[PDB]
Amino acid sequence: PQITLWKRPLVTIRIGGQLKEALLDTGADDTIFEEMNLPGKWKPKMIGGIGGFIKVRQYDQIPIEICGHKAIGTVLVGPTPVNIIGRNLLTQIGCTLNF
Amino acid sequence: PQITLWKRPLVTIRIGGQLKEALLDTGADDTIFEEMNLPGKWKPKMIGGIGGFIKVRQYDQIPIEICGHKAIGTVLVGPTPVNIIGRNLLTQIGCTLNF
Numbered sequence: 001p002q003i004t005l006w007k008r009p010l011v012t013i014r015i016g017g018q019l020k021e022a023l024l025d026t027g028a029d030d031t032i033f034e035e036m037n038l039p040g041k042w043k044p045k046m047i048g049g050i051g052g053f054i055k056v057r058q059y060d061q062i063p064i065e066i067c068g069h070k071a072i073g074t075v076l077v078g079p080t081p082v083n084i085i086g087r088n089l090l091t092q093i094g095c096t097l098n099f
Numbered sequence: 100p101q102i103t104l105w106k107r108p109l110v111t112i113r114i115g116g117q118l119k120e121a122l123l124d125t126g127a128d129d130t131i132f133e134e135m136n137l138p139g140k141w142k143p144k145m146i147g148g149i150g151g152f153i154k155v156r157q158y159d160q161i162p163i164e165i166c167g168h169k170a171i172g173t174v175l176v177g178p179t180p181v182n183i184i185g186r187n188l189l190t191q192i193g194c195t196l197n198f
């Protein structure tokens with residue numbers, strides 16, 4: 001799709017068979033979801049944003065479907081204000097900025 | 100232009116006698132720049148993201164030039180680690196997400 005930016009670019013995603021809303025976020029290097037259960041091993045990690053650093057759980061090679069487009073990559077779980085799809089997955093679905 | 104997302108979407112912007120690098124950020128509601136001393140009236144504000152909140156000054160009707168495209172609107176100023184062009188100005192320069 002072509003998505004304009006008068007509203008937040010929130011899209012429904014499928015992750016672990018569950019539907020969630022997430023923000024397409026070109027200023028995020030990484031993908032972070034609010035607290036949820038994901039299967040398999042995770043690695044403790046820390047990441048920084050505008051307001052400081054947080055601790056997250058890093059899950060590798062997680063399939064996610066974003067508006068019907070498949071990605072498989074790293075998903076962090078931690079105290080983000082909203083679920084965010086970052087460039088690690090936006091690149092996999094072929095997303096670009098255009099003006 | 101078309102900007103891919105393999106790397107951070109940093110572009111040159113002009114805000115006064117300052118040429119700066121800023122992130123084209125679909126996950127940011129409003130433009131926020133690193134500490135600088137802009138002219139007019141303003142309003143204190145707190146903006147939140149990963150790690151918590153920062154205090155900023157909100158300035159209105161500030162003209163900026165983004166890759167040669169003119170914009171004019173709200174610019175927040177505060178201790179952000181990265182200059183960010185948010186949706187408030189991305190819309191004005193005709194920027195969309197496409198996949």
Ligand SMILES: CC(C)CN(C[C@@H](O)[C@H](Cc1ccccc1)NC(=O)O[C@H]1CO[C@H]2OCC[C@H]21)S(=O)(=O)c1ccc(N)cc1
Nearest residue numbers: 027028029030048049050126127128129146147148149181
């Ligand atoms: C978390 C988002 C809902 C909101 N943020 C914009 C977001 O794009 C920031 C923008 C950003 C970019 C770099 C540094 C700080 C903030 N990215 C971010 O936090 O990404 C994190 C996940 O991937 C990592 O890569 C970048 C930081 C990590 S925000 O910076 O907090 C923000 C919030 C409000 C406004 N008006 C402007 C910006």
